[PDB]
Amino acid sequence: EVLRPLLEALPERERTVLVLRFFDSMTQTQIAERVGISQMHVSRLLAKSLARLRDQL
């Protein structure tokens, strides 16, 4: 519940990727294929979003 406002504040593609990793427990490759971006782009978005959430929590 605490994370929800913070997730809505994330850029939209950051949020989708974060939720698919930590709520749906998809691998980064499965997330890459689902969103239609590269594996490296998924890792970049995860790193970015975790860095934002790290300082709000």
């Binding site: 980064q28 998924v42 860095a51 790290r54 929590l57």
Partner: protein, 131 residues
């Protein structure tokens, strides 16, 4: 460390935020050098950065961040530690703890404040990634 496998590498840098980028680069260079599943490597890289960032943010002045990457056949073990200003850098139920437990197969911590001098300030985190 002797229990470490023959391909282990220990890295030591000043526990300073300016060195986090160097640590990410070197950890990535090692993973590419290794055999585990790619999805496991990508998760482990994120978890090691989380560990290193939290340790260095809590590090005492002039502390050293000590990082061991031990690639084995079964698994990869990564251990990170530094003299810190708190007895627990990743508290149970914290967001950080949940992130680490999602990204690694096993997460363990170590700390013994009964030890005198700087050894009693050391806090460590060990991550294990299998298959």
């Amino acid at each position: 460390w002797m229990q470490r496998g023959v391909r282990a590498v220990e890295l030591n840098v000043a526990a300073r935020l300016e060195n986090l980028a160097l640590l990410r680069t070197l950890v990535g260079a090692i993973g590419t050098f290794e055999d585990l599943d790619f999805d496991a490597v990508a998760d482990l890289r994120l978890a090691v950065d989380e560990v290193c960032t939290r340790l260095i943010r809590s590090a005492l002045p002039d502390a050293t961040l000590r990082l061991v990457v031990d690639p084995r056949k079964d698994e990869v073990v990564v251990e990170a530690s530094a003299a810190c200003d708190t007895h627990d850098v990743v508290a149970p139920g914290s967001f950080s703890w949940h992130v680490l437990t999602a990204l690694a197969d096993d997460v363990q911590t170590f700390h013994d404040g009964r030890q005198p001098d700087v050894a009693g300030s050391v806090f460590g985190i060990t991550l294990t990634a299998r298959r």
